[PDB]
C-alpha cells in the first residue's frame, strides 16, 4: 500500500487533485416551491454527483487496496455523508443558504425536511466560524469514506491514522500551537458525528419519498438507498 509511504504533503496533493467537480443543476430560473420539483432537481444532481464520487473514491489513498466488496460497502455507507459535507462546504460563503449548485441556491423557506435543512446550515456556519481550509476539507471527507463502514481492518485504521497525521501537519504549517492543534483536531472530528446524524435522518427521509413514488429515482440511487435497509 503506497498510501502509508506517502508524505503529509503527498497525501494533501493526492486528495486535492482527486476532488470531484462542482456540478450544475438543470437550469431554468424557476424557483422550486413544489415538493416534486424540489426533490426532482436534487435527485438529478445527487445522481450525477454519485458518478464523480465513485471515481473520486478510487483516487483516495488506500481505498484501491481494499477488496471490491469492501469498496462497495464503504461507499454504500457514506455516500450521503460525503454529499452533505460537500454541500456544507460549498455553502460556507453563503450564510443561511445552501449551495447545492452554483445555479441552485436554496434557503430555509424552501422546506417542503426543514429540520435537516437547518442542521446543514448550522454545520455550514460552524465550518465558516472555524475557517475550514480546503486541505482540511478533503481530509475530513476521506475520513468519512473510510470510517463510516469500517465494521484487513487494520489497513483502514492505518490510513485513518495517516490522515490524522496529515491534519495535524496542516495545522502546524498554519502556525497553530501544540494545544490549538489537538483542539481543532477534536472540533473537526466531532462535526463528523453530526454529519452522520444528518445522513441517517436524510436516509429515512429518502425512503419515504421512495415509498410514495414522488420523483422517479435512478436505479443507482435506488441501490444506494436500498443498501441502508
Amino acid at each position: 500500500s503506497l498510501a502509508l509511504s506517502l508524505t503529509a504533503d503527498q497525501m494533501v496533493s493526492a486528495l486535492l487533485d482527486a476532488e470531484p467537480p462542482i456540478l450544475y443543476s438543470e437550469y431554468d430560473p424557476t424557483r422550486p416551491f413544489s415538493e416534486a420539483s424540489m426533490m426532482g432537481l436534487l435527485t438529478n444532481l445527487a445522481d450525477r454527483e454519485l458518478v464523480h464520487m465513485i471515481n473520486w473514491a478510487k483516487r483516495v489513498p488506500g481505498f484501491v487496496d481494499l477488496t471490491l466488496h469492501d469498496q462497495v460497502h464503504l461507499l454504500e455507507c457514506a455516500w450521503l455523508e460525503i454529499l452533505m459535507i460537500g454541500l456544507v462546504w460549498r455553502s460556507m460563503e453563503h450564510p443561511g443558504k445552501l449551495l447545492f449548485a452554483p445555479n441552485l441556491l436554496l434557503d430555509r423557506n424552501q422546506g417542503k425536511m426543514v429540520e435537516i435543512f437547518d442542521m446543514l446550515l448550522a454545520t455550514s456556519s460552524r465550518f465558516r466560524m472555524m475557517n475550514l481550509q480546503g486541505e482540511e476539507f478533503v481530509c475530513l471527507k476521506s475520513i468519512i469514506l473510510l470510517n463510516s463502514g469500517v465494521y484487513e481492518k487494520d489497513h483502514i485504521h492505518r490510513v485513518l491514522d495517516k490522515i490524522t497525521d496529515t491534519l495535524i501537519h496542516l495545522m502546524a504549517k498554519a502556525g497553530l500551537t501544540l494545544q490549538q492543534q489537538h483542539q481543532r483536531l477534536a472540533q473537526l472530528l466531532l462535526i463528523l458525528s453530526h454529519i452522520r446524524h444528518m445522513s441517517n435522518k436524510g436516509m429515512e427521509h429518502l425512503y419515504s419519498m421512495k415509498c410514495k413514488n414522488v420523483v422517479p429515482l435512478s436505479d443507482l440511487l435506488l441501490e444506494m438507498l436500498d443498501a441502508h435497509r
Binding site: 458518478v51 465513485i54 478510487k58 471490491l68 469498496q71 462497495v72 461507499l75 454504500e76 443507482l220 441501490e223
Partner: peptide
C-alpha cells in the same frame, strides 16, 4: 447484481 460493482471497475 449491483451497479456499484460495475462502476468501481470502470
Amino acid at each position: 447484481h449491483k451497479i456499484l460493482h460495475r462502476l468501481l471497475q470502470d
